[PDB]
Amino acid sequence: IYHRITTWIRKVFRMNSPVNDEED
Amino acid sequence: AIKKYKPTSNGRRGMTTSDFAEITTDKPEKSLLAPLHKKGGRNNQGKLTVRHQGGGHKRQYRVIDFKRDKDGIPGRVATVEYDPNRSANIALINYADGEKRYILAPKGIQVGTEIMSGPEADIKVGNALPLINIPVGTVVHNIELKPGKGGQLVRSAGTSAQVLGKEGKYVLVRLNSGEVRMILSACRASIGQVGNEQHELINIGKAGRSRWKGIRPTVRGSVMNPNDHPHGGGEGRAPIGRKSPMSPWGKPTLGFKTRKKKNKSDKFIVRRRKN
Amino acid sequence: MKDPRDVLKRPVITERSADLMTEKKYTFEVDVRANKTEVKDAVESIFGVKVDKVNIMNYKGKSKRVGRYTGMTSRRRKAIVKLTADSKEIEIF
């Protein structure tokens, strides 16, 4: 049995509401 | 006649519809039916050249020979039918040949009345004879601009035209709203103003009936964003501060002539803009 | 070319096929481009048996990875020919 295994990773994103208020 | 609706609902408060009294048969003859794909106002390129078009009810064209190229052959008015395509009602007419052709219908026509398309035909309504034989001042409809082309003039319901007199070239005619042109004497025309004059009096009474037309809503220009319309921008109902009221296209619309100053038809314009 | 004899590949030896032997029908692999009409002329020549209702089936290949290297199986196309009654088999012989 070869038992080959593979792993994959990804950065993704994103949001930025940013919900920040003031100073104005 | 006009059947006013009782205000059972908010859309009933103003809506009105024509009597449809002229109509006789519920269905069109199968032989003269033609397809009408709705372009929606888009260009063949696919872009929308005309604003707010399409979305209306499906329609099916009835063949109508405005040209009336045949002559000397008596006809008969068998039936009258509703026309979704235009305000004018359609009246089917059976030719002595057994030929059948839907034809524009002047008011006051009766079922079974004889109609000759020839030059020798009587002045009586529904007949179409050449302008040279037409007595001065009689009402005329479905006037052709050139022979064999069909009568582009006076096709809509309730419109009319009158002859001011005639020479060998060309016969005078009073076009609707008072404009006048020397239409060709040889050219054919049909006496008697088009019926369904009450169509102007009809009230839609709701946004929903307009969808069936289908007349799509038009946004007011000031409401539009400044990038989209010249009158756009401002802090709420912007004043038409900018000089000269304008279309979204750069040409002004209020009182600005759109006529080409040089045109082939300019010689024919004996009279213009009576207002 | 074309000839009936080259159309066939190998018999399908399965428990499901062995049960069909009593049904007077015998599975055989057949070329993907071959039609049912061609198969009917093959049994009549090779076996000489009268042919009744032929059935044919195609199969997409299953994956058969070997370590890192995956690879699709070739597409087999077996055929089922229902032989007429009273006819000696040549299969296994």
Added chain:
Amino acid sequence: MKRTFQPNNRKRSKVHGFRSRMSSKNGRLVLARRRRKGRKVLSA
């Protein structure tokens, strides 16, 4: 909620097919860029 990917093989084929690119010179350029790079899977 509904998302941008709502697959339809007839649409993917008519729009992103090899002949959809053969239909115009620009698509031929797309195929040319597809082949110069040596891609194992041209078109869709």
Added chain:
RNA sequence: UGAGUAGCGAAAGAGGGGUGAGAAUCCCCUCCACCGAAUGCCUAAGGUUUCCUGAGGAAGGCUCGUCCGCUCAGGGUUAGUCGGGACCUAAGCCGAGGCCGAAAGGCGUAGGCGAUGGACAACAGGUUGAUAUUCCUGUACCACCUCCUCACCAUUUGAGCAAUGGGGGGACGCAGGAGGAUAGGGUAAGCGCGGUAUUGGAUAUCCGCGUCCAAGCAGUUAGGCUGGGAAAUAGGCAAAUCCGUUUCCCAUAAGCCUGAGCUGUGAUGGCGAGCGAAAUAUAGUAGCGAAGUUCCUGAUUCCACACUGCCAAGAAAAGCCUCUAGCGAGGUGAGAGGUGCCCGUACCGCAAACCGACACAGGUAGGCGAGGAGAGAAUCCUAAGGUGAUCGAGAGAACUCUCGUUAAGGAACUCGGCAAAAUGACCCCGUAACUUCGGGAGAAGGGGUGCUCUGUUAGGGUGCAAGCCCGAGAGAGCCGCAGUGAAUAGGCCCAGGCGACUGUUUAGCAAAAACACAGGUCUCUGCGAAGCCGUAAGGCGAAGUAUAGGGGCUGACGCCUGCCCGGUG
């Protein structure tokens, strides 16, 4: 490092055994729980084997694991009739010559492509660890072809085939209401069961089952033909005993075309409650096998856009029905003999087999969708069929969340009656200001509905009767705090600003006093159009024609809409 800290991805499991080195998580059995207008099945899209059997199990299983949609070995989709292609056409696209454009290309005839449509012949049970209106056992059906078998005919005085041509037909909208019948549910009968030890029932007891198709044949619900016969024809590129049209004859139906679904045939066949072997590679089958009626109830299905009404008047062509043109020496009418191809058929499709990085509380046509109460695809509880929804154990702290309760008070809270509470189910009484006379208006405000008897009511549905049902009204009585007792099915009265309204708007902070609309008005436009999309050709507007279109402004309706042309257009 934070840490052995957060999380362990909604929402029942318990026990007995079995397997095994290892069992809470796997398997089987017995209870119990949840969905059941589905957490049920059937089939697209899409996935592309993830289906099945025998093993393995390190990794992928928010945990172990003997188990997997995992990892390995083999195995599994069967078609003239199902879907699509050897048929057609729509939007749209391609497009000979061609019209245009520095080039590349753009546009568009003839023609072709293209279903989400039209045309089209197979239905009932059985079968495997699977795939079955494909395999099988029955009965069939369509199209095509003659070594054939009979029957009828005619040799250009022409028996017949009859078009790429002409017509007919196909052929189409929305809403509503009767009617006929059925897919489905339940009653009395009928047949197989059991006498039940928890008080009491051989008893108006209990459990379970109560049948069957396309077709070849007959007729019937009923609808549609408006009539049929004769003569004449400036027409339907040529022609027509076809159509259209015209003139007479007979018109209360002879006749013309289509019917759901029924009765017998299809069936001296098989489904069926229940018995359930030898044993085989001890699963559980093979195999045997009763009754199979009647009434009530019935649509969202079919007859069928059939009927009625309405406006906003609602595809295209072929398959077909005919006509001649035109082909002709052997053809037609029925039986037998054969032929009938190319692809899709597995499984997952309310989802752990897909859109979502995940085995993710979201998203995914349509076709079947039961029972009790109920108007009902509301709601609650249950059939058919599934689901034990894959980290748990136990203490019962704060605190956070989801809820249930609440003494006396009430909005004293708060920017603000936010949230919550309350009202709400049918029948009946009753109902104001104001108003465009429609409304407002479930106004508001109250009463009665639970169970028993007279009452297989009064009255209706169907039926010969017998019976099953839909069911008030009442009277007398019984009870509890209670009575649409559970669950879900409006809180109102006012007074003003803005907006006529419905509707629409920033998907992912703002839905509105915003937008839009009908209406009102101005202006422009005479067709080769004003406005446009484009270098152009072409096309939209428009198969339109000033009672029609384009643009600006204003917003239903009522009362109105004053003055100024110096300046800027």
